């Protein structure tokens, strides 16, 4: 029943502003205190702000005092977070909760950076088609220099899910680099097609890179 659905996150420059919204569902909104709580990329939880059911009595930690404003709309059953003078340190997944929090919403990601949206360069990694051996060849895909997260990698358009390992992204000074690997039996070796497919939502890029245990 209780539902909390957050929205409004996105990439914003250092110093800009943003408005997060939280739509409550399944309770008497009004009788509840509400809080904003964020999870940094290192997965630490930071409480950002709290508002009483009646919306009189607000508290904020010092980090955010005077930059952020918590507000609620008891009619429309909306909790709001106005953020301003945003810093790189406020880059996190922002959650909701109803009062400790007994109910959490899904999170909205907010990334504060100067980096500009850049699509990936996708590179096939075909084994040194000698330096192998068995019915178990591992192919790969390198997904370099893109911003921001995420990217979706598929092996042959989702079909191949057995084998596949997608390694988290590493920020090499304002571009991420990602790799994905797949293990198929030496059938397909050139035996058939193996295609890594990557989509970069933020850049509207869909790319298909055909490996196949090829090359020299």
């Amino acid at each position: 029943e209780v539902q909390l659905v957050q929205s409004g996150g996105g990439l914003v420059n250092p110093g800009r502003s943003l408005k997060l919204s939280c739509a409550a569902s399944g309770f008497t909104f009004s009788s509840y205190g509400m809080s904003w709580v964020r999870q940094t990329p290192e997965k630490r939880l930071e409480w950002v702000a709290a508002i009483s059911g009646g919306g009189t009595y607000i508290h904020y930690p010092d980090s955010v005092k005077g930059r952020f404003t918590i507000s609620r709309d008891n009619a429309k059953n909306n909790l709001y977070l106005q953020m301003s003078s945003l810093r790189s340190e406020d880059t996190a997944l922002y959650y909701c909760t109803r009062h400790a929090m007994d109910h959490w919403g899904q999170g909205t990601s907010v990334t504060v950076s100067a980096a500009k949206t850049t699509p990936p360069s996708v590179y096939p990694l075909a084994p040194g088609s000698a330096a192998q051996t068995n019915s178990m060849v591992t192919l790969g895909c390198l997904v370099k220099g893109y911003f921001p997260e995420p990217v979706t990698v598929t092996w042959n358009s989702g079909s191949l899910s057995s084998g596949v390992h997608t390694f988290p992204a590493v920020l090499q000074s304002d571009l991420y680099t990602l790799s994905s690997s797949v293990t198929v039996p030496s059938s397909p070796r050139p035996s058939e097609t193996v295609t890594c497919n990557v989509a970069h939502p933020a850049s509207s890029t869909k790319v298909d890179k055909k490996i196949v245990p090829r090359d020299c």
Binding site: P61, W104, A126, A130, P168, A169, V170, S179, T183
Partner: protein, 214 residues
């Protein structure tokens, strides 16, 4: 605006084992300590409120205790559906503070990495870049050491290492080690070696390629 320190940071346990997760307050918080469970790709969920009140529907193996500065979250026979992150939060004073959490990992049999080495793709070279990649797949434990050697010499400068989280399906770990190089730097040499030292073995697991087989 008090510190809650959780120990242990990480714990590896077999389903059926008993565990204690500690959370220590830098100042006496009475019984204003709440515990949250968080699983991969899920939001935190309230397990226990006021040191010892399990929230309705929580299964019986979970229980909490403590007062003043020391709290412990005990799980009796750990179930597989219990592996994840655990956090303590204080409501004693403002601002509300949280512990860094404790990660619970499924201890399984020891497994040696399956290592794959790949030379740069031609498309990358044409861009005048060269990434040499090494996948060190499905091993246990998580500790592994990777070393690169170019023409027999060790190379630390330029390596980006990435580790997955415990496989959802088999409890192993995977890691990718990338040796990033200029095009020209790459062509100055012939042999690239990726050597993995893993508990499962006495001697290093090694894969090599030269500018040799096309």
């Amino acid at each position: 605006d008090e510190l809650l320190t959780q120990s242990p940071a990480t714990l590896s346990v077999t389903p059926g084992d008993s565990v204690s997760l500690s959370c220590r307050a830098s100042q006496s918080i009475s019984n204003n300590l709440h515990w949250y469970q968080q699983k991969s790709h899920e939001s935190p969920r309230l397990l226990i409120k006021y040191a010892s009140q399990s929230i309705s529907g929580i299964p019986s193996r979970f229980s909490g205790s403590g007062s003043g500065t020391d709290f412990t979250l005990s799980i009796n026979s750990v179930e597989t559906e219990d592996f994840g992150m655990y956090f303590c939060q204080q409501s004693n004073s403002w601002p509300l503070t949280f512990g860094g959490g404790s990660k619970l990992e499924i201890k399984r049999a020891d497994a040696a990495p399956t290592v794959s080495i790949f030379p740069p793709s031609s498309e990358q070279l044409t861009s005048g870049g060269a990434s040499v990649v090494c996948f060190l797949n499905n091993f246990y434990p998580k500790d592994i050491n990777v070393k690169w050697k170019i023409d027999g010499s060790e190379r630390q400068n330029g390596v980006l290492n990435s580790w997955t989280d415990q496989d959802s399906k088999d409890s192993t770990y995977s890691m990718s080690s990338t040796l990033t190089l200029t095009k020209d730097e790459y062509e100055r040499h012939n042999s690239y070696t990726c050597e993995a030292t893993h508990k499962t073995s006495t001697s290093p697991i090694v894969k090599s390629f030269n500018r040799n087989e096309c």
